[PDB]
Amino acid sequence: PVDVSVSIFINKIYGVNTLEQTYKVDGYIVAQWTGKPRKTPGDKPLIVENTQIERWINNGLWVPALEFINVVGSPDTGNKRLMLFPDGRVIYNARFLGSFSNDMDARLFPFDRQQFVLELEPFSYNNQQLRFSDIQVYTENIDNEEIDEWWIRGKASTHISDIRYDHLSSVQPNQNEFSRITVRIDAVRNPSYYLWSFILPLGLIIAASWSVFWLESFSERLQTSFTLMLTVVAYAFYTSNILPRLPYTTVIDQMIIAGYGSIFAAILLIIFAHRQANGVEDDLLIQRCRLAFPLGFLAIGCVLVI
Amino acid sequence: PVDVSVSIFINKIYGVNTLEQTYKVDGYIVAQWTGKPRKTPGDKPLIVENTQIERWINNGLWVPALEFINVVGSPDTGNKRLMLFPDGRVIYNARFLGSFSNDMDARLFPFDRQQFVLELEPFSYNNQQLRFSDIQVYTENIDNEEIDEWWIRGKASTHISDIRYDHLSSVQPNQNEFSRITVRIDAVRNPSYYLWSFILPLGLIIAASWSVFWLESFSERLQTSFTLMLTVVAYAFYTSNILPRLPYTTVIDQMIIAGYGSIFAAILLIIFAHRQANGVEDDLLIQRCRLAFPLGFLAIGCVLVI
Amino acid sequence: PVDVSVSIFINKIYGVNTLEQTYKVDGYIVAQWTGKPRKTPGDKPLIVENTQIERWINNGLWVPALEFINVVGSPDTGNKRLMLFPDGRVIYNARFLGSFSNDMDARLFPFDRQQFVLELEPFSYNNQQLRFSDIQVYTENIDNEEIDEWWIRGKASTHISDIRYDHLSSVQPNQNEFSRITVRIDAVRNPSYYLWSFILPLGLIIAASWSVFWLESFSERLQTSFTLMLTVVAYAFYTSNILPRLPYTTVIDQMIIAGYGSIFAAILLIIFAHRQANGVEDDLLIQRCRLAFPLGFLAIGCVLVI
Amino acid sequence: PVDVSVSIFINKIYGVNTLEQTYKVDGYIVAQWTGKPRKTPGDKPLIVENTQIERWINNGLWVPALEFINVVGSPDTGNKRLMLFPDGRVIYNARFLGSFSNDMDARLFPFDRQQFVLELEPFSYNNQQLRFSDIQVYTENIDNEEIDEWWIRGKASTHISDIRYDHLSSVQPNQNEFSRITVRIDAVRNPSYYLWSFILPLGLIIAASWSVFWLESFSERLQTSFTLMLTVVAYAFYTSNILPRLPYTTVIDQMIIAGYGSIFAAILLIIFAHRQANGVEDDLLIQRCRLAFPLGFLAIGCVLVI
Amino acid sequence: PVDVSVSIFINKIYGVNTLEQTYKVDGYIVAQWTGKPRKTPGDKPLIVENTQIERWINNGLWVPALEFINVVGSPDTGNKRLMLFPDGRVIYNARFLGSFSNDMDARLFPFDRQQFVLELEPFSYNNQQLRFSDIQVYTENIDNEEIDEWWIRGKASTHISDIRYDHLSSVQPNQNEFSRITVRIDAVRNPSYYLWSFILPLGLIIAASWSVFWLESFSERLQTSFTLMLTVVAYAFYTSNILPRLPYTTVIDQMIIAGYGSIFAAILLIIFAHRQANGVEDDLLIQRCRLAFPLGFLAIGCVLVI
């Protein structure tokens, strides 16, 4: 079995797409193994860059193809180099920018947390072993965090394991285990923008919707309630045109429904006050829910976190 | 005839575009046939990766070109390998990401169901036969489904058939039948998001439009109806800016039209009560349709499913 | 002159862009001509796929380059093959996906009709002739049409002509005519969606805008007219954010202006009745145009189709 | 010095991007120079297409690289050919589609005018001369213009000049002048759509804002003015979501501000009439600016063109 | 150590993406070093363009790979040339268009300032030195500035430094320092558009919201306040659909929140005047904050700049 040591440098993780569950990763990847010795031009180790690499492979040099399992399409590999040491060591260095996939749950959208994973396996060789993996996610941790969109929880955690592919050929008696490197980086979303510019104005509108009971006339309460209904629809539009569309209901999507229900229940209550015989307007209801309707919403919001 | 066995691994099916009738498919494709034996370097089977594959073809190696029929443009092939066995067997392994096309009907948009198909044929050889097809759609079935946007109904169905191309040359006496592998995967759309954040608020607004009859004055009924008219237009905007545009009317598109008619019919009814001579306001109409107008909408909605 | 027979198979025509006047075309293209006989490996005809074609050209094989005239950028060619017959025949088969250009007039947007054209010429040879062109647009005609966005009027029309390039060199005495194949496919847009989800609600809003005259007070008429003005502006937004933006006025764009004018003309009339001395409200005007204003709009709409 | 004659055929100029100052150009480019004679296979001139061109260069053929200066990234070259004449002439013909950059001023947006420029220089040779440039902009001038988005003013003007690159090496005594071909095509924007569907409804809304003074009550004037404020914001939204966003203020952007100012000045005037002691409502102001406020806007609009 | 002199020509810096912290850079890059002399064909220096460069490398020519550190994906290299002087000098000239990354803080959005940086290092050689760097950012400084979106503060500053990569192999005793060229260009955003078309109308809306206290009736004050609430939501939509979305709160985003608070505080004050026993309307409050509410906002705005 061949021993191959990898080193993955993460320069930047950006372009997080919660819908397609994808994220771009820019950086370098280095792999080193020890093979049969070689005569270098001059004793010092040789450097073979980019196009010259394939010429060495055509002459018989062994360079294994390592595939990112969870990658989304072939990544954009920049400069690539081979450092051939005379004692048999071979160091492959390559700059890459690629999009990777991992399951993402963002139902608690403003305060959700995800993990970015990378998975590396040899494409064709099972008789070759990844000896140790060292990541270098030296992006900042306490430089810009309150300003940045994501908060990395800490240095990445690595994991080398063996995967048993069952569905294979009929000629392998026992060789169906491959070496997989699985790196994981925990992260939490910065809720600053989504609190100040979305949850706060929603509360202001939802709270202002309860001030309909402080109007004197019954005719005044129903017509202004229709205007409040339009205002929630207007905010539901703004909150959906700017926020990323998603195939499931988020925390914010629920608050929008909550504002819809608050107003629709008000219209029923206003028409209700029917309730009394001979045209009495049940003024003890308008004044009671004048403060209870704000409280009933606050009581329902706490059971949302049950 | 040459016997070729295929195996298609589906990692992920994403990027479903109901408009262009396309969807992305990521995974691997393997093909195996037995040819003339060969002397390997060492007795064990050889592995030829990526750029080294074309060199063997230039020396005369036969590798048939397999084309995805329903593909949309040349797919993005990742790592490719040839495993040459000495006893004549040849295994072609390739990672691919490609966009495929199939007809999609989504008139019942929140509750529609589609199937994703793959169709594989040899590009130039009719005297060569695809012996058996095995798909490996080992994406989850009971892990994340309520959270996911699509619900796969179950393991994919395979189908090998023969296609008769009529319009061909004049030199083939009888050889105009090609072997087609047809994989089909059934799936149903997750209606959770589209119900809670779209159909539900639509019902609330449509219902609240009927509360115009609980107003006392005739002047009150017409002006608030214009506000209701504006409210439906505002919701038709939000529901069309976030939902995928389509060249036909969906279930939701029909509900939007229904809300328009409900309000316009109300404006006609409010003006109608006108009907009575000497300025009578036909108060038995306002109170009758106060509950009947909600019921007439429910009766028409049931005949929509006729 | 060399005789070259073409055959173009159209799988799918999608991605119609009325703005840039482009449309994607996926399918295969076949060309056959008879050249000097050849010794095949075995008597039967040879098949040369993909990378191996250029090797034969480097050894002197004549393969003419055929250019799509109206193409927009180099198309995406899939699998390509050469079928070399021993008696001299050569069959070139290639799968392609390309974007093509043709002038498009869509002023009658919901009910417009266009034609998709392809234009094929030899790139460098005028002393070579395209003998006959056969298209195979075997997309459905009676399968899905009401569900589909476009209605193909029928099988495509072919056309081989000669183009006289005047501005050329000074060494050709008379050879400046090239063979052009021009394929044309007629099509009509499916107006189902654009009628139900756009033209219909506009009429409802425009008609409901005429219900302002059934209000009793003069103060009531002006304020609801401003709400109607906002409603048309709101609909003008929705109709332009979802429909494709265009550099000219369509049928729908004219109706939008018509709703603007209807309301603006109403505001002038309401203020007019302012006209009468001593504060008379000209009640014979409000009631007359109560029905005439709908009719004047219908009368003006008929002269639009003049 | 080597004499090189160019000929540039412009099929279509589309995709004008006023923001990035870019525009797409599709067409052909031909270049001809006379070199050392050559032995052709057969006496007639040879045609070398696409991949075969590099083989002749590897054997020593001189083909100079001509670079588009104002290009934005490497263009998409279609088919390329070399016509080698035996008397030394060489004709290079290539189809290309590329994006070019040029400064664009569009402050008078609906009625602005621009020019599309091309600049061609040899990439490495200063001891080689571009003898004459002939453009073939045979796009229509009198076919479709009112229907088309841009109006080409007339046939393109050519211009060959010399550029003095100062910052160079230290080994060139005086050879720092290169030959530049500069083609310029004038064009004016079709204001039909932007007049009918934007400037016209803006005037309708702005004018209708002045009808607030024809209301009788002071309470009526302020509340409807707030509705007018919402209508302008709604139109400012519609006019900015469909029109191309720009980093400077256009003619339409100024009218939007003008509508904002008209309404805000009205709100100040309505509150003003606060001005009079003992609660007098200054009815001579409401009626004066009832027509003067429309006139003051018309007077301010004329000084905008000062 | 090899001495390498660079020269970087910047034609244009466009496509600034404050979200992804990226910006496109088009221009040329030149590098010159002196190596072992060579026999040129003729005494004068040779010019090797594009495809012919790799042929010289296959014959043993040393061309070091220089990588842009902060680049985002492989850049688009246009024409590339090698000027081989007989005395050993080698001049590499290449046209490039690439997107570069640098941290961007835009919290003071209309009046923020950024710097565009480029970072160049040899990819594999540490025993090679960049001797001096000369940038040529000869974009205008006094031509178009008020018209342009960004204001370049002045000529770029160069900086050659040494980077100590710690995490390296175990065979380098001390050679882990590479030569880095760091170019920096300061720039300030043109606030003309964002002031006239956004901050100005926002103040107009925010100020007009304070005119609610000049209404006479209490019922009038609350309902028009809801219309103002809808107007701010409408403007928050318009300002967020056109301005670039960002993961943090800007200057404009704070003003939007300020308008939200101004109105919600008004709704509380109107209901407050509850405050007085027996139904007194506290008219000394409505008139006091009639001017104080405008002043309290201005006082809060100054402490925003604290």
Author numbering:
A (entry chain D), B (entry chain C), C (entry chain B), D (entry chain A), E (entry chain E): 11 to 283, 285 to 317
Reported in the publication:
During activation of a pentameric ligand-gated ion channel (pLGIC), the binding of agonists promotes the opening of a selective ion conduction pore at a distance of more than 50 Å away from the binding sites. Each subunit consists of a predominantly β-stranded extracellular domain and an α-helical transmembrane pore, which interact via an extended interface. Our study has identified a cluster of interacting residues located at the β1-β2 turn, the β6-β7 loop and the pre-M1 region of the extracellular domain, and the M2-M3 loop of the pore that exert a strong influence on channel function.
For two cases, the ELIC mutants F116A of the β6-β7 loop and Y258A of the M2-M3 loop, we have grown crystals and determined structures at 3.5 and 3.2 Å, respectively. Both mutants crystallized in the same nonconducting conformation that has been observed in all known ELIC structures. Small structural differences in the vicinity of the respective mutations indicate local rearrangements of protein interactions due to the loss of the bulky aromatic side chains. The data suggests that the mutations, despite their severe phenotype on channel activation, have only a local effect on the protein structure. In both nonconducting conformations, the interactions with the C-terminal part of the M2-M3 loop with the β6-β7 linker remain intact, and the observed nonactivating phenotype of respective mutations (F116A and Y258A in ELIC and F115A and Y250A in GLIC) could thus originate from an interruption of the coupling between the extracellular domain and the pore region.
